[model samples]
Target: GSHMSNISLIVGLGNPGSEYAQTRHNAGFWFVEQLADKYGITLKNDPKFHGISGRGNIEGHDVRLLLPMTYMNRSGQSVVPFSKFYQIAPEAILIAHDELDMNPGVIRLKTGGGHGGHNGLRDIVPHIGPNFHRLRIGIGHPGSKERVSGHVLGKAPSNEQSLMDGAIDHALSKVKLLVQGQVPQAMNQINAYKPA
Candidate 1:
């Protein structure tokens, strides 16, 4: 049944439940939720993929958004099935998630880069065979190696909140460009863009 489905899928990777909600680990979900609101859509939990799912139209084509409920390190389980069932290609998908290698308030959208020690992304590559889009939300690296996990799971400091919001909004605005198949240009817009 994987024929000619013109849906664009966006998967936001994060663990489920209120406990993980505000944590940096769930920034993916936050971004997707904001995007959904921009389109007047709501995510409905789907047990089949163990995530929340939603669909809306963008630029006259169907757009699907997913938030995997599987634990971060196990997120691929949700992505594989959803992509397969909808007949979505790796290039047509976009995933939003945290990235500690970058400074907070920066967003990096990429494809096929080394995982850079992100367990969630490392898990995703095997199932999808190494080619997929990403909207990398900057969480900023820890001051010292010993504080890595704590830094990622902790809240963003008050001062960084606005920059984080701006980056997410920029990502959200680019969804139409991506879904319409202008990824190279979209990538340029996201990657080469600098804020004032």
Candidate 2:
């Protein structure tokens, strides 16, 4: 049935290759890695899905993780095939990606919004619709249009990096509630979190 409240698929959007590693753009990758570590799930490459995939349980609810192998712009290519194969509904998916609008160390969760210039979302929405949940990890912008590209693709300084780490860690602590469809409860806790 399509009425399942639990999140079945969790996708982390990012480009492939080490060149993009550690950049603010890879914040989504950091999220999936953290989840995998916490759950002891090993994400392995799946040629058919065009991504690395893992399966685990959160609060006894089965969940699957996906990290697309395609570049950020083609993220949907991986997502569509995987979802179809697994019979996962668009509403049962949660997408994690970097957010430029918020400052570092901040995180937000919402459902059904426009991509807002995020290339990954731009592609994924057409394939899966916009009903999916989103966990937006804040990566502060570079202040100007031209610098925007370099900013997301560039490495954050150590101090800011620590903030980002803290933000993800905070969000990590709340995943059980998130996957259980207790999003309002999860949001209340996450939004109220202040890094120490």
Candidate 3:
């Protein structure tokens, strides 16, 4: 029993040329990368999709994967061109992006909400409206707004970095239930996942 719908497309938002592998802003990319590898799917740069794109089977369902090379502010361009061509509804898409509000290693899954000042989410809203699933991967926030940019662009300490990776792994473990429309089960367990 679930309150939401299944997701067919998963989009991970991040800068194309990230400086460090663990750059906090690229948290989204990290999730997708792990998922792709788990499924043995190689995401490749596709001009038609305006990003790195691939498709794979999850719980017997064909799922599309995307990472916008269009930069944070212009993520909508990469998403819509690909989404429209495939007739994927906004509701069927899941976006994994870094969350500033939650502490590192905290992961929350939900559907439909405002962008919450996140540039990637903000850009996607105008493209498809805000009726899609979200995998909010917490990255912990800087104490002040002025430090936000530097914080996200920089690498987290090894301990916090490990937590984030663990969070993604936890989410990955529940993919079958998630892709099969069993949202409540996945959400219940994922929401309660702790770093320690």
Worst 10 residues of 1 by lDDT: 1-10
Cα lDDT tens digits, model 2, 30-70, are: 99889988988889988898899998777787889999998
For candidate 3, write residues 1-196 as lDDT tens digits: 1123677788998988746456898999999999999998789988876799899897787888999988877889898878888888887788999999989999999878899989889888987899888899999978899999998888899988899999999999987777888877888988989877
Among all candidates shown, the one with the greatest TM-score: 2
Q: Once superposed on the true structure, which residue ranges of model 3 sit more than 4 Å away at CA?
A: 1-4, 18-20
- lDDT per residue as tens, model 1, 1-196: 2212222888888888888888888889889999888897779979998789998887777888999888999888888888888878876778888888887778888876767787788888877766677889888778998898898778787766667777888888887777777777787888764445
Q: Which pairs clash inside model 2?
A: none
RMSD of 3: 2.7
Cα-based lDDT at residue 55, candidate 3: 92
**RMSD per prediction, one decimal?**
2.2, 1.3, 2.7
RMSD of candidate 1 to the truth, in angstroms, is 2.2
**Candidate 1 residue spans exceeding 4 A from truth:** 1-7
lDDT of 1: 0.80
- lDDT of every model, 2 decimals: 0.80, 0.87, 0.86
